[PDB]
């Protein structure tokens, strides 16, 4: 399961995802112990990995590369989508990753 999110929220929340043992491939712009903690394989945002993603998350942000990625993700026939509704994106994004 792969997810697409804006670059700023991934860069700002890198340490929590690293604690979640989720791989990160970012492009900059300047209960007993279980087998695994989260089901997500990769959270990133690029043109190359849109063909492998299965969902995407949209939020108000600023970056010159989110437009094409979001449009190509919306082009997909069979993909899930989530949107942010007010407040902080911190807890909402963390909860979505936890229950994905």
């Amino acid at each position: 399961a792969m997810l697409l999110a804006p670059g700023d929220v991934i860069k700002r929340s890198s340490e929590e995802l690293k604690q979640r043992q989720i791989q990160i491939n970012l492009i900059d712009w300047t209960a007993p112990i279980g087998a695994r903690e989260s089901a997500v394989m990769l959270v990133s945002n690029s043109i190359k990995d849109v063909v492998r993603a299965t969902a995407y998350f949209t939020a108000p942000t600023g970056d010159p590369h989110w437009k094409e990625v979001a449009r190509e993700a919306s082009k997909k026939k069979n993909i899930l989508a989530y949107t942010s509704t007010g407040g902080d994106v911190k807890t909402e994004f963390l909860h979505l990753i936890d229950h994905l």
């Binding site: 007993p32 279980g34 087998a35 695994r36 903690e37 989260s38 089901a39």
Partner: peptide, 8 residues
């Protein structure tokens, strides 16, 4: 199976 819950 689901990895996050299976095995307990």
């Amino acid at each position: 199976i689901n990895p996050t819950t299976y095995g307990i």
